[PDB]
Amino acid sequence: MKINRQQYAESYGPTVGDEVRLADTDLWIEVEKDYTTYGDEVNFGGGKVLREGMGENGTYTRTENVLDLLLTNALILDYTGIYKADIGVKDGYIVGIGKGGNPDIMDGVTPNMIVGTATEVIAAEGKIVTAGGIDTHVHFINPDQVDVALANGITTLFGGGTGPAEGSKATTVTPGPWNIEKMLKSTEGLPINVGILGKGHGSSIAPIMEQIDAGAAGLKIHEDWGATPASIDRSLTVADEADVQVAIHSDTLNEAGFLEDTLRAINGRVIHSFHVEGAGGGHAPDIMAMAGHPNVLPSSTNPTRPFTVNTIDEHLDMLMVCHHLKQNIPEDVAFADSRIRPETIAAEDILHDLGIISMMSTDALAMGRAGEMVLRTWQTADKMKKQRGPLAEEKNGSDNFRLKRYVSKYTINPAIAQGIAHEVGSIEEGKFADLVLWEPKFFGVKADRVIKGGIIAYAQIGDPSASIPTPQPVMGRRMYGTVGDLIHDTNITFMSKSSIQQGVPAKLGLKRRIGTVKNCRNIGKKDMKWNDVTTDIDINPETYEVKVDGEVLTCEPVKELPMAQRYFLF
Amino acid sequence: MKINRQQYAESYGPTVGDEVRLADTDLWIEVEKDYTTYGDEVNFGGGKVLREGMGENGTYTRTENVLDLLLTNALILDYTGIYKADIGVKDGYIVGIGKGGNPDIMDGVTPNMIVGTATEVIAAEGKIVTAGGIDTHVHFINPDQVDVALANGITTLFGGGTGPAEGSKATTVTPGPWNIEKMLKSTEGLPINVGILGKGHGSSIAPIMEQIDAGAAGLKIHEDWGATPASIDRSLTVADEADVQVAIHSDTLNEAGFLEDTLRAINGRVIHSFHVEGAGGGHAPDIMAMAGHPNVLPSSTNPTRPFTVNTIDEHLDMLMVCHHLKQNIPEDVAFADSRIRPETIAAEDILHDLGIISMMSTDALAMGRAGEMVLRTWQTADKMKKQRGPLAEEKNGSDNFRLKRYVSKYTINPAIAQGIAHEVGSIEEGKFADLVLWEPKFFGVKADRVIKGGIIAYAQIGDPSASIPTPQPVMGRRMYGTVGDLIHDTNITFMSKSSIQQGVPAKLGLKRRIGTVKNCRNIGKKDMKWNDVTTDIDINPETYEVKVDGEVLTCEPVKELPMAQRYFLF
Amino acid sequence: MHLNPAEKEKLQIFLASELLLRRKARGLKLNYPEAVAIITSFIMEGARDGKTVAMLMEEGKHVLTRDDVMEGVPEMIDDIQAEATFPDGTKLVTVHNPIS
Amino acid sequence: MHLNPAEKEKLQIFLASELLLRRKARGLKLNYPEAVAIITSFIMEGARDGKTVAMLMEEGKHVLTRDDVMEGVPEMIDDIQAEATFPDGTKLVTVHNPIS
Amino acid sequence: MHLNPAEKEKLQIFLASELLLRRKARGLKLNYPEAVAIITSFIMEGARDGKTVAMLMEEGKHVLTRDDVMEGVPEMIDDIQAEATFPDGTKLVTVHNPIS
Amino acid sequence: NYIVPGEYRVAEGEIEINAGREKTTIRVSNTGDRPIQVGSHIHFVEVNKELLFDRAEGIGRRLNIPSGTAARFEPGEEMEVELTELGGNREVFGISDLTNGSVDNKELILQRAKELGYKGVE
Ligand code: NI
Ligand code: NI
Ligand code: NI
Ligand code: NI
């Protein structure tokens, strides 16, 4: 007995060789391999396979290779591959990627993926499953930002801030031991993973280091606090000792140096360069040349992504408003004209496509959109396909190489840069079960269900008074993972090794899972998955033209994007 | 090099001799003094002063005279003065009022106001900063009342209630040890300081006192529970032993006595007389004469403030509804006509202006508006300026004397009456950092940011999905001070000395800061800042005319108020 | 806009009244929540117009009549209370037995 | 519908603008929150219409004039900022000194 | 009014439908959330009008046609489900493939 | 009588900044090919290497401009600026690591500046 492929995909989701359109883009992903045994697919419901004696084992206790949760028939899109599998979760972690069910009667069951009495089931057939997004450029300004992030599939927020204080409104910084302690305590109530950055500023080690010992998970060097050679140096000496990452928003004004001076102060040490294109800040006009260097882990923020016809008008005015500029102060219009450049924004699209900018991020509420990191990543990939063609590395008509290159920018790469990829950032065995299910029609736009630590935290679901959950109004809502003390077991607070060894969690009464930041100082550009290109980026000081390997990098702005007016109410 | 005053004020906020209009009132406040050093003003941002090596010190650790938070360039309006300063906060308390920055390179830096690595910055330039309001007449009826209070700059709620039970809907009372324990536990989740009043009723000491030992912070004597000579006496004997305050809503009906009988039962002991004018309740018609006595700390509630053309019609009907009166019961219309009096409401405006009524309060949800204490205080001051002229004590054309008299009514005076002024009620060194920033255009109407224990708790802030926090919709929202366990460190539960000594906080698992109520029994009218007048208030029993020093106190109702239809959507 | 908690809530009364008004215009006899929303919004808009508390206590009794509403609705509504910002600040309006 | 947090919030701006427009149509001088709601909704609907950011920065200054609003309102509104989904994605529009 | 949780939520569907209807009236091709809001509100108002579940399953397929909406919108909407209070209590209406 | 809510009514006069401190005028050239903008409170001797001026005249000084403002030098631009004296303890730490102590140690500051190529020493 045979099933035609259209009917097969309708019932169980796609299989080897089938392609799926990403939302309303022109991007198609292709199933590379499938872990199932045709005819022994797992499925749940009235009269279906996962029933006692059948696809559900009736013999084994939970500890005997039985899962807490099985996601059936997922189409995984990850740096590791684009493929079809069941995902098994236990104790909050991904423990098996393969084929779930009962070894009594099915062939090919992965040995620790038994569906038993203890197992909950999520049907992922017809859904695309990705890792939760890792946003490493978050300003903690307004707690309403968390649901915004969750709704677009973000599960980890790394950054800083104390609320709507001017320091935090400008910089991803939670300054000093007391503010850090207070925000670790606030974090107990946020339904998302969090890591906190201290102020990467000072000329003595102690004032900087005491933040790391207090519970910070990294540092931020920002020009608003003085991105001088000294603060750069002292922060990287602390980071190399503490094994945490340093981010930088460099001196736009070139006050104490040009880009080469900041690179000299870095002295080959690893650093994460935020909004590397420079509209979001940094040495004018040539900060984007940071993305060519081996010791630099380069991210973009999202307002410039991708280059559209309203971008320049919007950014010139945004900068006037947020940086308080006056058109009647000649220095302020020169400053703006030196910072907001179509030449570097157009090239940024192409540097993403080439794998020279490795990461995406938001810059949430300071100069970036909390719920648009994932969104704008796929809009950029789609624009690049249209303008540059399918990459050369594509095969058999799919956009899989491009899709793996771009999914890495907001999942595994930020996690590696931050020293947290042992816990999150990808759909791999042994990693925390932060998983996002997407309907293909909404892929990258609005998440279906967001799983945090193995329990659904956020979902698009309807009328709570209805007979079934699908009637209107269907909207994003917090689920049982966010309620009561379950918010503690489903989320991770990432902290330095020294704060953990000094017993900060117990001191402050932290109940969240505590994650250790490690292995951040011996990495480089070569460790950024699918985005590991080092090259000499030349930015002309007069014209702002960007060249890589002797060629000018330019592309046009687009008038329309997918993942836009077809979906949003406003 | 010199800067003209208009440009100076635009950049750094006003300085000595400059005046600022309070919202859309006719009231002008004048900067009396300024702690800065002209040219070494502190300011934060791209290329600004608070940067490492410059206005931010790069050497000192947090414990070495470094602040957790600096509010730059605040215009303080407080009983202590109307003046320009930086405010430094550390460990949740105000530790310095003066000049912040770096002693390396600036002149005049207050020694414990160093901006260092550990310091967060709030820009207060162009803002008016006041203490958080202290509302000592709160009925705990509906938890949605807390954001209402926060939005109009209230940071401490003293009163009682268990929710929408009839006892609590009528009286500021949380009765008995069990209800008190339950509401102390509920208080753990309210983002505002709280003090709880027990039932000030009984004829034996034990039943009353056991409430104080259970965790109450004072008592309420209310006519609905029997405001008899015995309950008055027993409550004040308990209060004198326990060192807590007693409030009273006296016997309107004169059942067991007239005002002189209630004064005889008080017997010279200190007491807080609620809604002293009497529309809100008390011996008809002459309860307002309480405000002349030395042992009486007199407050108004807010529906009568100030006297307007709709006041009488509104109050007659409000009383009919809330007191369940029938127009077909002659006793009920006589009761209403004896209680709601234009003669005493008009005089109440003038008694506030003279400093004879010392305090304002809400009567939230029982006969008063949770979010209008601050609002109506300034509307009253504005009405009095128009009708009576600038006070005689004014100088050089400002309304500073009036402004200090009126700001005291909802900040320091309620705190002194309650025995909590060692912790809150004013912007002074050594007091808890409960601070409210106001844009002058919204002063007294809608707070910009409310700081609780050094962390922003509530703010008017915009779209959480936007690139910056200022896009619409700008609305009042809870901030990170209210989330997780940070709600415990940013708020105070005020309790009696005996409950604290008997270990109630530990018994109940209270995690909030615990504040001690003390020094409430040896104070009097003379201790009410700027509002310390004792005099013989005569209220004519036939005509209800009020006389002070032989003169009739009368003024007209107004048809329009400032801080009204220009601001509110409804 | 600087919306406070009450302003946000009271927008929803206006919306419910717009809904009810559309229902009445297409010929429906109004129900309990619909009648309350219409009269409440009338009071709040009256305050915004600068009418007095006394004018609105009078006018509120003529907004809906018993033929406008379902059987029993008049007797279910003992009074309708609303606070709004008049030219002289927030005041409470109670309309007693609004539908005879 | 799949409403996200911002979509739900921004519905309330439209509603406030409908309220304000009705107030203006019956002859009232508009207040601060009313004026902000009208101009904000104009920007967001303009984005939905497919206008550019530059067109809306121009047009936003002609939506309300000083005779439409209460005394002091023009000077209270330094600018109005709104983000909406244009044909090319979310963009920020700021209308500077919208009411002269 | 005694608003319950569902009544408050469902007001926002009506509002989204009013928004969408204004967008359609000024000539726009409607998007996904707009189309869903219009059809959902139609069902809930139909229930309020006293129509049967069977009438609304029929009528719901003729509220919007493919020329009213953007490319792809018809195929994105497999069905629209709404519960409302009919004369005989709450019932669920599902309109299948509403836009052909 | 028109009311602008929250408006100022400033006093008469002007505010003199950095009163009583020595002022010095110097010529400064941006020899680089990118713009340099210098804030009010940076120790002037520790600015970008490619700004050419008499480095000794920057020691213990900063720009004499309103707090939080800046002077801008376009590529190739030479202009005069006015400096004022640093106050307080007259010590500078960090920034470009040219001082790290008293600003009185002019010979040590200049030796470090010359060795690191900060243009204009002697
Ligand atoms: Ni930045
Ligand atoms: Ni940032
Ligand atoms: Ni009372
Ligand atoms: Ni009361």
PDB file of N, CA and C in Angstrom, chain D residues 1-3 7-8 11-12 14-15 18 21 44-46 48-50, chain E residues 12 15-16 19 22-23 26 28-34 36-37 70:
ATOM      1  N   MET D   1      -6.889  35.499  14.341  1.00  0.00           N
ATOM      2  CA  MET D   1      -6.252  36.740  13.921  1.00  0.00           C
ATOM      3  C   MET D   1      -4.755  36.743  14.214  1.00  0.00           C
ATOM      4  N   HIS D   2      -4.347  35.997  15.239  1.00  0.00           N
ATOM      5  CA  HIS D   2      -2.976  35.994  15.734  1.00  0.00           C
ATOM      6  C   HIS D   2      -2.528  37.373  16.215  1.00  0.00           C
ATOM      7  N   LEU D   3      -3.324  38.036  17.036  1.00  0.00           N
ATOM      8  CA  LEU D   3      -2.962  39.355  17.546  1.00  0.00           C
ATOM      9  C   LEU D   3      -1.729  39.270  18.451  1.00  0.00           C
ATOM     10  N   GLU D   7      -0.336  44.940  18.369  1.00  0.00           N
ATOM     11  CA  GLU D   7      -1.594  45.032  17.626  1.00  0.00           C
ATOM     12  C   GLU D   7      -2.758  45.297  18.579  1.00  0.00           C
ATOM     13  N   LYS D   8      -2.754  44.605  19.714  1.00  0.00           N
ATOM     14  CA  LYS D   8      -3.803  44.856  20.710  1.00  0.00           C
ATOM     15  C   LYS D   8      -3.740  46.257  21.265  1.00  0.00           C
ATOM     16  N   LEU D  11      -4.870  48.997  18.652  1.00  0.00           N
ATOM     17  CA  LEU D  11      -6.317  49.090  18.447  1.00  0.00           C
ATOM     18  C   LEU D  11      -6.907  50.189  19.318  1.00  0.00           C
ATOM     19  N   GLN D  12      -6.402  50.327  20.548  1.00  0.00           N
ATOM     20  CA  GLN D  12      -6.903  51.322  21.478  1.00  0.00           C
ATOM     21  C   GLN D  12      -6.586  52.746  21.046  1.00  0.00           C
ATOM     22  N   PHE D  14      -6.635  53.678  17.757  1.00  0.00           N
ATOM     23  CA  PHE D  14      -7.719  53.871  16.797  1.00  0.00           C
ATOM     24  C   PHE D  14      -9.012  54.236  17.520  1.00  0.00           C
ATOM     25  N   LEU D  15      -9.355  53.479  18.555  1.00  0.00           N
ATOM     26  CA  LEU D  15     -10.590  53.770  19.300  1.00  0.00           C
ATOM     27  C   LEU D  15     -10.603  55.160  19.897  1.00  0.00           C
ATOM     28  N   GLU D  18     -11.294  57.568  17.146  1.00  0.00           N
ATOM     29  CA  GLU D  18     -12.713  57.600  16.793  1.00  0.00           C
ATOM     30  C   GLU D  18     -13.499  58.441  17.800  1.00  0.00           C
ATOM     31  N   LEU D  21     -12.656  62.184  17.231  1.00  0.00           N
ATOM     32  CA  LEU D  21     -13.271  62.647  15.994  1.00  0.00           C
ATOM     33  C   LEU D  21     -14.750  62.947  16.202  1.00  0.00           C
ATOM     34  N   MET D  44      -0.767  55.919  11.566  1.00  0.00           N
ATOM     35  CA  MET D  44      -0.878  54.472  11.416  1.00  0.00           C
ATOM     36  C   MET D  44      -1.766  54.074  10.264  1.00  0.00           C
ATOM     37  N   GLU D  45      -2.867  54.780  10.006  1.00  0.00           N
ATOM     38  CA  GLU D  45      -3.699  54.483   8.843  1.00  0.00           C
ATOM     39  C   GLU D  45      -3.026  54.898   7.538  1.00  0.00           C
ATOM     40  N   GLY D  46      -2.216  55.952   7.592  1.00  0.00           N
ATOM     41  CA  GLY D  46      -1.430  56.390   6.450  1.00  0.00           C
ATOM     42  C   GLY D  46      -0.440  55.311   6.028  1.00  0.00           C
ATOM     43  N   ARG D  48      -0.798  52.130   6.592  1.00  0.00           N
ATOM     44  CA  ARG D  48      -1.646  51.074   6.069  1.00  0.00           C
ATOM     45  C   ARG D  48      -2.095  51.376   4.639  1.00  0.00           C
ATOM     46  N   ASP D  49      -2.240  52.652   4.305  1.00  0.00           N
ATOM     47  CA  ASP D  49      -2.565  53.104   2.968  1.00  0.00           C
ATOM     48  C   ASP D  49      -1.390  53.009   1.991  1.00  0.00           C
ATOM     49  N   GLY D  50      -0.175  52.894   2.493  1.00  0.00           N
ATOM     50  CA  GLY D  50       1.007  52.736   1.682  1.00  0.00           C
ATOM     51  C   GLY D  50       1.751  54.034   1.408  1.00  0.00           C
TER      52      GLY D  50
ATOM     53  N   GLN E  12     -13.152  43.610  21.559  1.00  0.00           N
ATOM     54  CA  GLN E  12     -12.002  43.917  20.729  1.00  0.00           C
ATOM     55  C   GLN E  12     -12.111  43.329  19.330  1.00  0.00           C
ATOM     56  N   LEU E  15     -14.264  45.888  17.534  1.00  0.00           N
ATOM     57  CA  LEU E  15     -13.427  47.049  17.194  1.00  0.00           C
ATOM     58  C   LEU E  15     -12.530  46.798  16.003  1.00  0.00           C
ATOM     59  N   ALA E  16     -11.871  45.638  15.944  1.00  0.00           N
ATOM     60  CA  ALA E  16     -11.009  45.284  14.816  1.00  0.00           C
ATOM     61  C   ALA E  16     -11.799  45.212  13.513  1.00  0.00           C
ATOM     62  N   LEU E  19     -12.515  48.764  12.332  1.00  0.00           N
ATOM     63  CA  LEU E  19     -11.282  49.243  11.728  1.00  0.00           C
ATOM     64  C   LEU E  19     -11.133  48.722  10.304  1.00  0.00           C
ATOM     65  N   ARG E  22     -13.590  50.192   7.766  1.00  0.00           N
ATOM     66  CA  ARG E  22     -13.189  51.526   7.322  1.00  0.00           C
ATOM     67  C   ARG E  22     -12.082  51.458   6.288  1.00  0.00           C
ATOM     68  N   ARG E  23     -11.169  50.494   6.495  1.00  0.00           N
ATOM     69  CA  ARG E  23     -10.090  50.257   5.556  1.00  0.00           C
ATOM     70  C   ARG E  23     -10.659  49.792   4.224  1.00  0.00           C
ATOM     71  N   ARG E  26     -12.359  52.652   2.190  1.00  0.00           N
ATOM     72  CA  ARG E  26     -11.534  53.625   1.465  1.00  0.00           C
ATOM     73  C   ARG E  26     -10.719  52.993   0.346  1.00  0.00           C
ATOM     74  N   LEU E  28      -9.074  49.719   0.256  1.00  0.00           N
ATOM     75  CA  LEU E  28      -7.960  48.805   0.438  1.00  0.00           C
ATOM     76  C   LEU E  28      -8.343  47.331   0.293  1.00  0.00           C
ATOM     77  N   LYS E  29      -7.442  46.555  -0.277  1.00  0.00           N
ATOM     78  CA  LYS E  29      -7.535  45.096  -0.258  1.00  0.00           C
ATOM     79  C   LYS E  29      -7.164  44.686   1.172  1.00  0.00           C
ATOM     80  N   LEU E  30      -8.049  43.941   1.829  1.00  0.00           N
ATOM     81  CA  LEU E  30      -7.814  43.566   3.224  1.00  0.00           C
ATOM     82  C   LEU E  30      -6.809  42.449   3.412  1.00  0.00           C
ATOM     83  N   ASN E  31      -6.166  42.495   4.581  1.00  0.00           N
ATOM     84  CA  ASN E  31      -5.169  41.493   4.955  1.00  0.00           C
ATOM     85  C   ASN E  31      -5.768  40.400   5.827  1.00  0.00           C
ATOM     86  N   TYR E  32      -4.920  39.506   6.315  1.00  0.00           N
ATOM     87  CA  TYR E  32      -5.337  38.362   7.098  1.00  0.00           C
ATOM     88  C   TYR E  32      -6.112  38.695   8.352  1.00  0.00           C
ATOM     89  N   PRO E  33      -5.578  39.442   9.299  1.00  0.00           N
ATOM     90  CA  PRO E  33      -6.284  39.739  10.537  1.00  0.00           C
ATOM     91  C   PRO E  33      -7.542  40.561  10.307  1.00  0.00           C
ATOM     92  N   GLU E  34      -7.513  41.480   9.344  1.00  0.00           N
ATOM     93  CA  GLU E  34      -8.668  42.273   8.949  1.00  0.00           C
ATOM     94  C   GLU E  34      -9.821  41.405   8.438  1.00  0.00           C
ATOM     95  N   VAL E  36     -10.258  38.154   8.993  1.00  0.00           N
ATOM     96  CA  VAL E  36     -10.752  37.340  10.096  1.00  0.00           C
ATOM     97  C   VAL E  36     -11.641  38.158  11.017  1.00  0.00           C
ATOM     98  N   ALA E  37     -11.236  39.390  11.368  1.00  0.00           N
ATOM     99  CA  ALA E  37     -12.071  40.224  12.222  1.00  0.00           C
ATOM    100  C   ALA E  37     -13.447  40.524  11.617  1.00  0.00           C
ATOM    101  N   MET E  70      -6.122  40.601  -0.022  1.00  0.00           N
ATOM    102  CA  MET E  70      -4.804  40.489  -0.611  1.00  0.00           C
ATOM    103  C   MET E  70      -4.604  39.057  -1.124  1.00  0.00           C
TER     104      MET E  70
END
